[PDB]
Ligand binder design. Structure first.
Ligand code: HEM
Ligand SMILES: O=c1cc(-c2ccccc2)oc2c1ccc1ccccc12
Length: 459
């Protein structure tokens, strides 16, 4: 009875567009591509707002770009945030390399713990490990500092991503049923933890913020995204496009660091999950990797176009898993209509991406994981299908770190699959259970990892 599941089901009787009621709020769910594309794209702007939920307000000390409203001040915050994400990567020559180094560097520490903690036929839950590996890629990209996988204070800071999606996830009752805060219950519990975690994240980034600001003297060369945003803001305040104001820099680096670390973490956990539940797909991608990059070195972004199956497994896991089933709730900015239906200004809207990835007609093997589903008659991928998958949303509020997400999940998996073997715990009868909320996170599950060959990952 997962949200995105009921909605897609209610659509088989009331159409793609219809409205539900969560407590006091009547939400209008969008389910198909034409409806999703007609609201978010064609009438994008009418649907580019965020609902006035008290919890959204708590994120990033009240200055979130992801959870804030549509307005001019917001408009430059996003433009400025998207600018950093586009330029930051591919800004200077050899930049791609420094990025790939971080991934390569976390991939090494990641396989090492997985293999070490999997000796003699042992199994271990990969999740905690995958969060730390992805947060470090971004800890270094954003602050220029990575943490020890043993670091408690950091593993703690990142041990609450589930409480975050349960609070803001479409379906959540925290906002729409405030009376639930009046007494003990899971909803009272999650929201209080929610405030607790956002409070910790902000302080974590605030501390780093104040230090980068202090060390960034006149002629100083920025060596971060923190340093990059601060410089830009000082250059903005200091006389004379879209750049952030110093007061908004901590909040926006929080959204940036927070999203990636959560989403990329969740995504990664599915890849290994799928690898262990589909040994054959694991072998094929693991085969193509051997044929193209050779057992002679480890994969790099240069190999991406000669790896049609890897990219295919990538988009199949994306469509099949739909780990971000419904986008961050939207809100209309003006009375509008979609697929005929009237939608009055200031109404909360849910975009069902899962309903576009699981549409029978567009995807024949709807419930079956078929990476070949994206392979062209002669073995190459066809953007026409690969780009038919919806996970990063579309429109004004579409993800700002899409290419980064991709040129990273490709790498983590390329190294891991090329260097390791993943086996599921056979003794586990009942199946994998998940936690629904913004992202679909896998609940506890154990894998066993062994090295195909000697570590050349060691530098
Ligand atoms: C595979 C990983 C990721 C997926 C599937 C994903 C997807 C999404 C989705 C579904 C949204 C909501 C769109 C909407 O409400 O209409 C979004 C928001 C956003 N994403 Fe991502 N994301 C991921 C990675 C990233 C990364 C790496 C960053 C960090 C740079 C990031 C930052 C953002 C931001 C700042 C927003 C809010 C944008 C806005 O409100 O306008 N995401 N993403
Ligand atoms: O701004 C955020 C966006 C996002 C986000 C997540 C998924 C998709 C889009 C945005 O999440 C977070 C954010 C901030 C802090 C978080 C702390 C824990 C877990 C997630 C956080």
């Amino acid at each position: 009875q997962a949200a995105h599941l009921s909605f897609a089901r209610l659509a088989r009787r009331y159409g793609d567009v219809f409205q539900i009621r969560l407590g006091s709020c009547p939400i209008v769910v969008l389910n198909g591509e034409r409806a999703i594309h007609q609201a978010l794209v064609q009438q994008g702007s009418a649907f580019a707002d965020r609902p006035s939920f008290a919890s959204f307000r708590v994120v990033s000390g009240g200055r979130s770009m992801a959870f804030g409203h549509y307005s001019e001040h917001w408009k430059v915050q996003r433009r400025a945030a998207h600018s950093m994400m586009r330029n930051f990567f591919t800004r200077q020559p050899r930049s791609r390399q420094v990025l790939e180094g971080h991934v390569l560097s976390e991939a090494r520490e990641l396989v090492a713990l997985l293999v070490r903690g999997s000796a003699d036929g042992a199994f271990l839950d990969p999740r905690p490990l995958t969060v730390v590996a992805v947060a470090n890629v971004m800890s270094a990209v954003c602050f220029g500092c990575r943490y020890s996988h043993d670091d408690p204070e950091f593993r703690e800071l990142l041990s609450h991503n589930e409480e975050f999606g349960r609070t803001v996830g479409a379906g959540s009752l925290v906002d729409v049923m405030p009376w639930l805060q009046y007494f003990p219950n899971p909803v009272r519990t999650v929201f209080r933890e929610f405030e607790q975690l956002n409070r910790n994240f902000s302080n974590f980034i605030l501390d780093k913020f104040l230090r980068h600001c202090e060390s960034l003297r006149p002629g100083a060369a920025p060596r971060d995204m923190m340093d990059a945003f601060i410089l830009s803001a000082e250059k903005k305040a200091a006389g004379d496009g879209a750049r952030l104001d110093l007061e908004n820099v901590p909040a926006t680096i929080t959204d940036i660091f927070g999203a990636s670390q959560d989403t990329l973490s969740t995504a990664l956990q599915w890849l290994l999950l799928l690898f262990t539940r589909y040994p054959d797909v694991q072998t094929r991608v693991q085969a193509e990797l051997d044929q193209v990059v050779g057992r002679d070195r480890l994969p790099c972004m240069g190999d991406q176009p000669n790896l049609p199956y890897v990219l295919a497994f990538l988009y199949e896991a994306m469509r099949f898993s739909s780990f971000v089933p419904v986008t961050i709730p939207h809100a209309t900015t003006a009375n509008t209509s979609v697929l005929g239906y009237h939608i009055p200004k200031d109404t909360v809207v849910f975009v069902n991406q899962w309903s576009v990835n699981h549409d029978p007609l567009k995807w024949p093997n709807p419930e079956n994981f078929d990476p070949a589903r994206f392979l062209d008659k002669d073995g190459l991928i066809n953007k026409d299908l690969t780009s038919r998958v919806m996970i990063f949303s579309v429109g004004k509020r579409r993800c700002i770190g899409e290419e980064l997400s991709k040129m990273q999940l490709f790498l983590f998996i390329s190294i891991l699959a090329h260097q390791c073997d993943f086996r599921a715990n056979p003794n586990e009868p009942a199946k994998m259970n998940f936690s629904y909320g913004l992202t679909i996170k896998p609940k506890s599950f154990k894998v066993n990892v062994t090295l195909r060959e000697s570590m050349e990952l060691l530098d």
